[PDB]
Amino acid sequence: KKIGIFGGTFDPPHNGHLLMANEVLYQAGLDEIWFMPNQIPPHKQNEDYTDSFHRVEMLKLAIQSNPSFKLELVEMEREGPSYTFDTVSLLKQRYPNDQLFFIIGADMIEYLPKWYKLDELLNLIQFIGVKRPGFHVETPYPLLFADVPEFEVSSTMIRERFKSKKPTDYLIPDKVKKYVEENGLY
Amino acid sequence: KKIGIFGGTFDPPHNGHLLMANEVLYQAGLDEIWFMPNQIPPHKQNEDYTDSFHRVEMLKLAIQSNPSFKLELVEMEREGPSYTFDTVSLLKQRYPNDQLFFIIGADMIEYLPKWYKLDELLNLIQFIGVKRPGFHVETPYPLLFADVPEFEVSSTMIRERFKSKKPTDYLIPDKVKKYVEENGLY
Numbered sequence: 001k002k003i004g005i006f007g008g009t010f011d012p013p014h015n016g017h018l019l020m021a022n023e024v025l026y027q028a029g030l031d032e033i034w035f036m037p038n039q040i041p042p043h044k045q046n047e048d049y050t051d052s053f054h055r056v057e058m059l060k061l062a063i064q065s066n067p068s069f070k071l072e073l074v075e076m077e078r079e080g081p082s083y084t085f086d087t088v089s090l091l092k093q094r095y096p097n098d099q100l101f102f103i104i105g106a107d108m109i110e111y112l113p114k115w116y117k118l119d120e121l122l123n124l125i126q127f128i129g130v131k132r133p134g135f136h137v138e139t140p141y142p143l144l145f146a147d148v149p150e151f152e153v154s155s156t157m158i159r160e161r162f163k164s165k166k167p168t169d170y171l172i173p174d175k176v177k178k179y180v181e182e183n184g185l186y
Numbered sequence: 187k188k189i190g191i192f193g194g195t196f197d198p199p200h201n202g203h204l205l206m207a208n209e210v211l212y213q214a215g216l217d218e219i220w221f222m223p224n225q226i227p228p229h230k231q232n233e234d235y236t237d238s239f240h241r242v243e244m245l246k247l248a249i250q251s252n253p254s255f256k257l258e259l260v261e262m263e264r265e266g267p268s269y270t271f272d273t274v275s276l277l278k279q280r281y282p283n284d285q286l287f288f289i290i291g292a293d294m295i296e297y298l299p300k301w302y303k304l305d306e307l308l309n310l311i312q313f314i315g316v317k318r319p320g321f322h323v324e325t326p327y328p329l330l331f332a333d334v335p336e337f338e339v340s341s342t343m344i345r346e347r348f349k350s351k352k353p354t355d356y357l358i359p360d361k362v363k364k365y366v367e368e369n370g371l372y
């Protein structure tokens with residue numbers, strides 16, 4: 001079972017995610033994409049990253065309509081900063097017969113260096129890069145690519161959008177927008 | 187009444203369209219965007235557009251959920267190649283008290299020169315340029331700009347996608363995908 005782990009803090013989740021996952025899904029020839037949400041984002045524990053419960057909620061709304069997208073709360077499986085090396089380690093254990101790939105966008109590609117235990121991690125799983133507008137890939141690390149239309153949208157956009165009351169339409173599912181307004185986020 | 191005429195042949199209409207329009211609507215402080223479908227695309231009369239009726243049908247689906255998006259079939263009422271001069275002329279007559287702006291993406295911007303009566307049209311109404319990924323703005327014509335998130339997605343993408351059965355999800359309203367599938371398009 002060829003699976004693509006798509007970790008992210010999704011605060012909030014937006015179309016850009018949906019499109020990349022859905023495109024990587026096809027391009028890397030995967031069976032299902034796994035949206036894995038951080039308990040507490042490793043690279044940002046000093047940034048004020050929404051309570052998790054709302055992230056997993058917003059996440060569930062953004063991916064319901066796609067049969068091939070599946071939630072994965074394995075990192076929510078208990079306390080401490082969610083370091084991919086630790087998680088992937090664990091995952092390769094629960095699912096030893098499945099083919100696993102991790103997915104990141106241009107953005108993170110630039111961050112590979114600052115990233116806990118990347119040299120051990122890269123040995124565990126293979127990485128798939130996409131290419132996000134504004135950032136750019138180039139890494140000196142083993143990484144496979146997947147052509148994916150560039151879509152300029154990041155959560156931080158929406159958050160500011162959602163606070164200065166700017167559009168946010170056609171950038172996040174109409175379901176995710178409501179949850180935010182409803183549950184008072186951003 | 188501040189209006190942004192958003193002409194296109196929309197074959198098919200896609201999120202890129204929806205996104206740009208909804209942004210320009212904000213960025214240029216307009217009251218509503220008018221999606222204006224060609225009867226027969228001026229700049230490509232020897233290609234294949236799809237009979238129109240479907241373009242208007244697909245167009246109608248894409249913009250239903252947005253109260254500020256409106257359909258304008260003015261060009262559909264009177265035969266022959268839909269030249270923006272002729273039309274904007276007429277428009278500036280039916281609506282003498284409303285503020286009218288036209289809208290194009292980097293795509294069209296590059297094309298301003300090969301464009302029936304630009305010099306006289308430019309006199310009639312003000313254009314608002316966006317910027318599409320792949321193309322790029324630079325023109326020697328009087329044009330205003332509206333910052334709008336780059337979204338690399340074209341109808342010609344979809345058409346090919348919809349015919350080599352590739353994803354198309356998250357690129358066109360799901361209502362638009364159905365119409366195509368049901369009505370045997372592309």
Ligand SMILES: Nc1ncnc2c1ncn2[C@H]1O[C@H](COP(=O)(O)OP(=O)(O)OC[C@H]2O[C@@H]([n+]3cccc(C(=O)O)c3)[C@H](O)[C@@H]2O)[C@H](O)[C@@H]1O
Pocket residue numbers: 006007008009010011016017020036038041042043082083084085103104105106107108111114115116117130131132133150151152153154155
């Ligand atoms: N338009 C777009 N086109 C393509 N991708 C886009 C995108 N907008 C956001 N994305 C991003 O969406 C995904 C994730 O969303 P987002 O919430 O922004 O992701 P983010 O919070 O920045 O972090 C990405 C993941 O990498 C892991 N990480 C990060 C840093 C350090 C370490 C470590 O162990 O040391 C691990 C962790 O699992 C995290 O969930 C991809 O990472 C991608 O970069």
Ligand SMILES: Nc1ncnc2c1ncn2[C@H]1O[C@H](COP(=O)(O)OP(=O)(O)OC[C@H]2O[C@@H]([n+]3cccc(C(=O)O)c3)[C@H](O)[C@@H]2O)[C@H](O)[C@@H]1O
Pocket residue numbers: 192193194195196197202203206222224227228229268269270271289290291292293294297300301302303316317318319337338339340341
């Ligand atoms: N991702 C994206 N980001 C921003 N904009 C994007 C876009 N993808 C498509 N678009 C385009 O969508 C809009 C229209 O859709 P589309 O079907 O592609 O538009 P298109 O068929 O290329 O032509 C644009 C409009 O210009 C007029 N025109 C064109 C050529 C010659 C003459 C003449 O007077 O001789 C007149 C005509 O009224 C038409 O409605 C904008 O033109 C924009 O460029």
